[PDB]
Amino acid sequence: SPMEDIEEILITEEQLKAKVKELGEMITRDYEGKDLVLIGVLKGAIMFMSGLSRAIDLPLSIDFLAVSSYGSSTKSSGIVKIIKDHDIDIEGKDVLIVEDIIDSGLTLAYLRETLLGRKPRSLKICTILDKPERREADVKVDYCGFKIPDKFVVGYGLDYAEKYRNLPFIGVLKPELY
Amino acid sequence: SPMEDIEEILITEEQLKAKVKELGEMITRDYEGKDLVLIGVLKGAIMFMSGLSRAIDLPLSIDFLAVSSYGSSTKSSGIVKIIKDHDIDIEGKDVLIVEDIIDSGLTLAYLRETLLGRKPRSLKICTILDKPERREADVKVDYCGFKIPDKFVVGYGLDYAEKYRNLPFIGVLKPELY
Amino acid sequence: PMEDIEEILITEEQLKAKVKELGEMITRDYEGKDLVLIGVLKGAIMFMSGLSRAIDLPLSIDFLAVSSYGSSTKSSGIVKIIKDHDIDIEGKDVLIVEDIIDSGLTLAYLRETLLGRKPRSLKICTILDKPERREADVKVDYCGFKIPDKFVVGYGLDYAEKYRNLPFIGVLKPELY
Amino acid sequence: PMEDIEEILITEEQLKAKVKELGEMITRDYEGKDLVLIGVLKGAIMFMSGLSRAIDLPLSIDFLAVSSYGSSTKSSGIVKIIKDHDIDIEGKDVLIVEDIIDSGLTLAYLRETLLGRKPRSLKICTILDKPERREADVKVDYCGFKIPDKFVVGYGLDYAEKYRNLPFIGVLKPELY
């Protein structure tokens, strides 16, 4: 059972469920009367995206982006290639970026600019996970789930070689599988 | 509250949670030792995809397709345009198609053929919702959640003009909003 | 085809000469640089093909395929990226290749998007240009021909996906649209 | 550019004549049909441009952009669709336009995919063909030139994204690769 590959659980299932419910409540109050559109980057965000949206008692829309790197450029600039762009015209709408994890914040910042260029009336950022230590880009995080140490984690959408996304918790795999 | 726009609940939240858990158990037993890859079509499938995968205690992978219609052709042939193809090479892998709802079964059958052309060792179909009455294509459904009557439903991923995907149940909107 | 055409504005030989001319200029202007031609499908493929073969320099070629978001496109030129370029343009000298410049809205938008990827330099080239229709800043560095505000077809330009293959630039009979 | 070339196999005028010839044949063969040219980027744009302008018929043009899945591509020619065609080809007469046919694996695969969309007819056209390398059925209806098994560049064909713009077909010096 993939859970046996985990050497440590950082955030439990109930901790996750609770926070998502918490964030959903906050966002629900903050976007009352707004025109909320949730946007996340595949594939890791679908987990949090599905959970957060059900926690938001507001009429809202959902869309996704699929990106790819240009190589070294991306690594140091966060500049990425658009593989699947969002279909909903966010012009004049209140967009909330939904991330699974913020690390360097480079790609997030780049995508933020791109989304801005499409004139949304509002543009905020919500993430379930955040690694402050790794932060090497100026990104304002409006909503944040948990600050985790600098380790490679899996679960709740986060994978390693496409596996472990289905774990109900956030944990660290054994080095052997790394 | 979007739930007030609903004139009737067909499948409750607990009914959904229960079935997804049920299906996950079945699939878990059936894919023991297999090389399971879950594939769904955006955007409606992310809800069921996220829930079903967590209900499957097996190492597994997830990927998505994004499609668009060619017009009348699609309507009568199910032939669609690929907007976002799956990234994982499914050659020799046990693929399980994850649908939110099977209606005519036309697009599902078309996409099934395309997926077959990529030589997966196995290719099955799982859906949370199914409208038998509308079925106008020969599609073998291996796993099925609930058979619903011929009505336009929303919730758990299903939308209407991009809204209602975040409802925790499957229901029918009031005709006024239609 | 040559039956729904009200009049021919630019001949095939006219197009060839101008392409050779623009190619020669770019060869001189970009000598010693890391040149990348980026055209916007589908219309730009004729010009892209003819211009690149007329540039006597080592260069790369890539394309963008875009789509409209609705009215947000008509008024602000904001578009959806359906196919992005694969070549990493950071530190490179990019030359946008266009079939025709009109309002300049979409062009202005894509221009900013590419700048977002930090190219060393970014210029714009188009075979056709409709001056009296401009409604966006955008500087055009290389331009083939200035034309009146008529619906033209040919050399890549279509009407309902037709006429792109005409080897000349012609005016479509208004009755056809 | 013309410095890393070991030898020239086909001149620019040679390419032009053949394109005109293939265009004339297709004009005769497809008269009265609903023709749709579909080329595979990036390599096919030169030939696509030259061939379409040499077909004196009303036609449509579209493109496919593909990517590899890994080894599954090398052995079975199975590819990932990065950019699909927008034109609905059902009931239409499609002509796949290729820059070069080698093993024929990817071509065979895309061919089946397009057939899946029920076109009235489906034929294949290529400017270049390497016979001794074929490792897939696939019938070629229109072919420009047969060439030996050498790595060629030019008229759309590249090596590391370079040389597509050469106006002739040349053999790349082995040292360069």
Ligand SMILES: O=c1[nH]cnc2c1ncn2[C@@H]1O[C@H](COP(=O)(O)O)[C@@H](O)[C@H]1O
């Ligand atoms: O600890 C981590 N685990 C998994 N992905 C991470 C982590 N930190 C940052 N990432 C990034 O998360 C992105 C997720 O890609 P996805 O798996 O396709 O959704 C990648 O670009 C990773 O580099």
Ligand SMILES: O=c1[nH]cnc2c1ncn2[C@@H]1O[C@H](COP(=O)(O)O)[C@@H](O)[C@H]1O
């Ligand atoms: O009752 C229904 N509600 C919503 N979508 C439905 C229903 N029955 C069939 N569909 C199809 O579900 C697909 C879902 O598209 P999506 O919303 O982008 O995920 C569409 O092509 C619909 O035609």
Ligand SMILES: O=c1[nH]cnc2c1ncn2[C@@H]1O[C@H](COP(=O)(O)O)[C@@H](O)[C@H]1O
């Ligand atoms: O007279 C004209 N003929 C063809 N295209 C035109 C003309 N004037 C402006 N355009 C632009 O050409 C673009 C071409 O899109 P494409 O056909 O997909 O390459 C359109 O979005 C138009 O806005």
Ligand SMILES: O=c1[nH]cnc2c1ncn2[C@@H]1O[C@H](COP(=O)(O)O)[C@@H](O)[C@H]1O
């Ligand atoms: O000699 C050659 N020069 C260039 N491409 C070749 C040659 N032989 C085979 N090819 C094929 O050309 C394809 C071109 O891809 P493109 O450059 O993206 O258009 C490659 O995937 C190769 O398999």
Ligand SMILES: [Mg+2]
């Ligand atoms: Mg992310």
Ligand SMILES: [Mg+2]
């Ligand atoms: Mg990942």
Ligand SMILES: [Mg+2]
């Ligand atoms: Mg579906």
Ligand SMILES: [Mg+2]
């Ligand atoms: Mg829908």
Ligand SMILES: [Mg+2]
């Ligand atoms: Mg253009």
Ligand SMILES: [Mg+2]
């Ligand atoms: Mg057009």
Ligand SMILES: [Mg+2]
């Ligand atoms: Mg080719």
Ligand SMILES: [Mg+2]
């Ligand atoms: Mg190549």
